């Protein structure tokens, strides 16, 4: 047993993975086995979702978080999000399961059978965390791989069938994207938008042309950065700004992943373009707007004048003005007037919601969509009772948007905590006091008194 | 040497579980309180006292099981098994809420036995009895909430039932009927509990992050030996850190640990005083100046007036099922509601 | 070089209060939030929080005391829109729509995040182990949950916690109405965290105070038996361990002071992490357990439980909260 106890390694069993910091072969085994775990969950969870999938029922009523991802890519769906073939879901699941067997074999082999350190076996695969050139080279390889993955998404959108477009004319449909937005003004203006209400930063991307053009830019930028880090050594300011150790690199990745988890939470909660409501259910804003639309339709059919109807407070019961003048839905859903959805945009004119198109141009499919989205709002209990907390036990529903947003907020927060833990520990270990204060050379004893 | 002295020697013998003289009071009473709660939440209904299911046998889960209080018509009856209500019948005694008074009385005497155990072990070991003095605050909470509060009210019915969701009902009842959040004694209790949690976290983190390096292990727990004489962490470094971060810092370890004793104990005692006041319905329900102003001025709104409307909703919507002995029949038109919803 | 002198002063450990770079951000933001909070709590005009032209007065000069006073959250018409002073046409409009709340909470959240960073920074400058900021991340996560994450999930800063005592109680009651937080396991873990934190605080304090070594006479305070900076331990750890091991049993007692103090740090911090996550996950409307009409008799009659009584209380709160703001049957946000 090499480095497999506390006396030789300095780490207890509950920090036992920290014994792998300077064992590149076993660390590679741990990483490859964990990657096998991720791919295993993807495949097994897809097969589990498919085995209980009822294709006529909406996906968001069935507790599905992975089939909507495949369906958004355009695999197995037709117009309106209707499932036309479940076989691509099966293919994705089984290919992930088999690939996870391969990755698990490799992880187990490098973890318990392969060489403990890769430096003697290969200068290419061996590494030292203090060697900044090798770290940037490995980072460059992985940047090229990520750029290729982004270009694979582009290739799916442009050549291999397209993507599901919820904004397609005549309901959502699978559409081939033939003119991606390559203008850097649009792409980096998304990057420079405010994160607050009405702006939404990158969460507010509302068409697939911008999505595909952004992934073209992301793939090219990642490939160029990968070549840049393969061919170049870190500069002096970078060498003086960072801690160069394995725990430090881990803490940097933990902070990045925490930020990405928060962004993914906001993306799945607000965006209905890359998370179409046909698959993930309506957003919270979408469902509130749908309720207002539903009761506007019902009362207009009863003969009410929805433009002049006055609520209890004197604001319009159905229609009011946003603070910048736009005609919006009344009630509490005044907070959600920045919502844009394909079932609502036919009723919008230049000044917001249009009274004449409200009176004359509301189609039965829009009324159906509003009722369906109102009654499948992302509200439910932990034991999956649909509705507000005061609802009785009859509806078994929690929206996949709720599950994804809550789970990834939990993960993002804990990864921020992990970033703080490892960044502090990497700093203390680089300076040499992560094990405690030296009794003979305590720094505060050499400092003057505060008062 | 005398039978009393021999029994004393046996009771104070070193064992895995210390018994002592206090054990005679503690172990039967604590065991019976715990066993009564487990038995009641596993097998015993509340159908005749509250009209509720409250056991696993009826289909409740861990959150919704409770040993419920007796019916309001019992008054403050001790509800002894041999008493005039049950008349020796165990089944009727369970159906009438006798397990509640069983658990409450045996728990009270078990708490007495545990504080006496703290005193006895402190006397034998040779330490000061500050742990028993600190345990006086949970005893004050239990006596004020489970005994004094229902004694001030009409019956045992309005005491908390021994269950998770039943305690949640008790919380919401105190909000709706007593406005217990507005009570300054409850505010002092909250300050004591949250300050105790803060002090616990901050003292633990401060000690763990000002440790001296006393070993080469990267896990520092092995660098402490219980028989060592030196302090395991730097008080000077901790003091300078908190003086520069927060402005003030402890400089006396004994004062720090007494303060850690003092904050949650004082908070719990203040909340117990407030609960005594609520036993007599001496509530901090309302501010009279705000209510005079709101009565004369229909445009004056505060968060306190909104809370009063919420309390009215709680009372009117909760009372027919929470107090079934009153036979409240509130028709739909008398229920206070906002627009829509 | 002026920049080198400024860097030396900022990172100096000889300042009475450490600044650091996190403090370079923290001091102006917390000063701005504090000054605006004091001014708004004393003298702000009423705020139309629900966006229904029904202004709520929260300042002392407009008829409040310390208990009922608050800085009222910004208007529901604003929602999540960024509302600085320069976005308003006048200061009267900014005050009417609850702009001070957005100013205070944004400056406070930035300053408190930089307070956490500053705690790390000073621990690094003093040669300390760095994880006090990790412990402080639990109340900071709680503040982020009630001031930022819950408004984001619900779509309006009007649903953030008001900056006042009675406003806090209003937030709690409406939150229980809409999300059944008492039945949420993360809030139950938080209650276990704070109750256990108070318990273990009282326990550790009483056990250390109980085992203090005699250094003083009966007239003086026992606290004078400890001298600041002394090397010897001021109490007998073995005697406290012997007491607490006889109080329960030997293996429920810490004989290791480092493990004990790690437990004291870890229990309330993890509990408060879980309750802050509970507030955030209920911000995305993943509510507490719903056992309404769970117990059904043989015929099909509903047998009520304590959860049904809780549901009655929640219904009372739900139908009375924001009594003029709802036009439609479902309170969807």
């Amino acid at each position: 047993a090499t480095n497999r106890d506390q006396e030789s390694s300095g780490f207890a069993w509950w920090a036992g993975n920290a014994r792998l910091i300077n064992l590149s072969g076993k660390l590679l085994g741990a990483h490859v086995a964990h990657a096998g775990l991720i791919v295993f969950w993807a495949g097994a969870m897809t097969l589990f979702e498919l085995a209980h999938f009822i294709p006529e029922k909406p996906m968001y009523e069935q507790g599905l978080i992975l089939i909507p991802h495949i369906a958004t890519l355009g695999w197995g769906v037709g117009p309106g999000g209707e499932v036309v073939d479940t076989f691509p879901f099966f293919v994705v699941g089984v290919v992930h399961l088999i690939s996870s067997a391969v990755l698990g074999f490799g992880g187990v082999y490098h973890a318990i059978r392969g060489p403990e350190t890769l430096e003697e076996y290969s200068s290419f695969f061996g590494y030292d965390w203090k060697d900044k050139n090798k770290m940037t080279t490995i980072l460059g390889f992985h940047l090229i791989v990520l750029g290729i993955g982004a270009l694979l998404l582009v290739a799916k959108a442009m050549f291999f069938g397209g993507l599901y477009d919820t904004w397609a004319p005549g309901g959502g449909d699978v559409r081939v994207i033939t003119n991606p937005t390559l203008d850097p003004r649009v792409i980096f203006g998304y990057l420079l938008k405010s994160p607050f209400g009405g702006e939404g930063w990158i969460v507010s991307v509302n068409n697939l042309e911008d999505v595909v053009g952004g992934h073209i830019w992301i793939g090219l930028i990642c490939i160029a950065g990968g070549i840049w880090h393969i061919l170049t050594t870190p500069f002096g300011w970078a060498r003086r700004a960072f801690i160069w150790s394995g725990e430090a690199y881990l803490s940097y990745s933990l902070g990045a992943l925490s930020m990405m988890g928060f962004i993914a939470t906001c993306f799945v909660w607000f965006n209905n373009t890359v998370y179409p409501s046909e698959f993930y259910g309506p957003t919270g804003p979408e469902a509130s707007q749908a309720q207002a639309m539903t009761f506007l339709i019902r009362d207009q059919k009863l003969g009410a004048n929805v433009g002049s109807a006055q609520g209890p407070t004197g604001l319009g019961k159905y229609l009011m003005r946003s603070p910048t003048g736009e005609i919006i839905f009344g009630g509490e859903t005044m907070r959600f007037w920045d919502f844009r959805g394909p079932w609502l945009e036919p009723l919008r004119g230049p000044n917001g919601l249009d009274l004449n198109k409200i009176k004359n141009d509301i189609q039965p499919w829009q009324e159906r969509r509003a009722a369906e989205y109102m009654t499948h709002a992302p509200l439910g209990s932990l034991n999956s009772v649909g509705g507000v907390a005061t609802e009785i036990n009859s509806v078994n529903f929690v929206s996949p948007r709720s599950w994804l947003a809550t789970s990834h907020f939990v993960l993002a927060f804990f990864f921020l905590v992990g970033h703080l833990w490892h960044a502090g520990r990497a700093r203390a270990a680089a300076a040499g006091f992560e094990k405690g204060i030296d009794r003979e050379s305590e720094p505060v004893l050499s400092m003057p008194s505060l008062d | 040497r005398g039978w009393f002295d021999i029994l004393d020697d046996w009771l104070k013998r070193d064992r895995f579980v210390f018994v002592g003289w206090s054990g005679i009071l503690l172990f039967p009473c604590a065991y019976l309180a715990l066993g009564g709660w487990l038995t009641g939440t596993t097998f015993v209904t509340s159908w005749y006292t509250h009209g509720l299911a409250s056991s696993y046998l009826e289909g409740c889960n861990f959150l919704t099981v409770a040993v419920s209080t007796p019916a309001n018509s019992m008054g403050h009856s001790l509800l002894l098994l041999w008493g005039p209500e049950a008349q020796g019948d165990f089944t009727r005694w369970c159906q009438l809420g006798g397990l509640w008074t069983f658990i409450a009385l045996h728990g009270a005497f078990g708490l007495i036995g545990f504080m006496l155990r703290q005193f006895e072990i402190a006397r034998l070991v040779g330490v000061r009895p500050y742990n028993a003095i600190a345990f006086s605050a949970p005893i004050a909470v239990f006596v004020s909430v489970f005994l004094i509060y229902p004694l001030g009210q009409s019956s045992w019915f309005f005491a908390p039932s021994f269950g998770v969701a039943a305690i949640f009902r008790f919380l919401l009842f105190f909000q709706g009927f007593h406005n217990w959040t507005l009570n300054p004694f409850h505010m002092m209790g909250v300050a004591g509990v949250l300050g105790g949690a803060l002090l616990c976290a901050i003292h633990g983190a401060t000690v763990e992050n000002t440790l001296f390096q006393d070993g080469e292990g990267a896990s520092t727990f092995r660098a402490f030996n219980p028989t060592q004489a030196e302090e395991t962490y730097s008080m000077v470094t901790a003091n300078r850190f908190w003086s520069q971060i927060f402005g003030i810092a402890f400089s006396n370890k004994r004062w720090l640990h007494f303060f850690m004793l003092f904050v949650p104990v004082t908070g719990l005692w203040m909340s117990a005083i407030g609960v005594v006041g609520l036993a007599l319905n001496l509530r901090s329900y309302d501010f009279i100046s705000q209510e005079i102003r709101a009565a004369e001025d229909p445009e004056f709104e505060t968060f306190y007036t909104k809370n009063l409307l919420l309390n009215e909703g709680i009372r009117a919507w909760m009372a027919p099922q929470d107090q079934p002995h009153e036979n409240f029949v509130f028709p739909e038109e008398v229920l206070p509601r906002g627009n829509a919803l | 070089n002026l920049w080198e002198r400024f860097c030396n002063w900022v990172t100096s450990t000889d300042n009475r209060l450490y600044v650091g770079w996190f403090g370079v951000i923290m001091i102006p933001t917390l000063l701005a939030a504090t000054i605006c909070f004091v001014i708004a709590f004393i003298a702000a005009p009423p705020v139309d929080i629900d966006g229904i032209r029904e202004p709520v007065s929260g300042s002392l000069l407009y008829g409040n005391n310390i208990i009922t006073g608050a800085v009222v959250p910004s208007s529901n018409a604003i929602g999540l829109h960024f509302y600085p002073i320069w976005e308003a046409a006048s200061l009267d409009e900014w005050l009417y729509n609850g702009g001070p709340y957005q100013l205070i909470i944004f400056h406070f959240l930035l300053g408190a995040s930089c307070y956490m960073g500053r705690q790390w920074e000073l621990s690094y400058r003093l040669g300390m182990r760095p994880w006090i900021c990790v412990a402080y991340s639990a109340p900071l996560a709680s503040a982020f949950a009630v001031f930022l994450i819950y408004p984001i999930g619900q779509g309006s800063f009007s649903d953030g916690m008001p900056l006042g005592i009675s406003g806090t109680f209003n937030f709690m009651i409406v939150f229980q109405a809409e999300h059944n937080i008492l039945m949420h396991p993360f809030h139950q873990l938080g209650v276990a965290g704070v109750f256990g934190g108070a318990l273990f605080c009282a326990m550790h304090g009483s056990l250390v105070t109980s085992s203090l070594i005699r250094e003083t006479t009966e007239t003086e305070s026992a606290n004078y038996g400890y001298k600041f900076g002394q090397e010897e331990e001021t109490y007998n750890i073995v005697a406290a361990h012997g007491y607490f091991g006889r109080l329960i049993f030997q293996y429920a007692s810490f004989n290791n002071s480092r493990s004990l103090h790690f437990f004291l740090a870890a229990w309330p911090v993890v509990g408060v992490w879980f309750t802050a996550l509970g507030i955030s996950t209920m911000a995305f409307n993943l509510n507490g357990f719903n056992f309404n009409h769970s117990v059904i008799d043989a015929k099909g009659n509903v047998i009520n439980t304590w959860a049904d009584i809780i549901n009655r209380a929640n219904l009372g709160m739900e139908v009375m909260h924001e009594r003029n703001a709802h036009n439609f049957p479902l309170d969807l946000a």
Binding site: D451 | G247 | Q230
Partner: peptide, 30 residues
Amino acid sequence: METITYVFIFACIIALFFFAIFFREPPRIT
């Protein structure tokens, strides 16, 4: 009258904060 009382007590607390931070008993390390 009550507003003046609240502001006075709050200002006394802030003054006490100032004196407790900057005019404390100095921790003299022995």
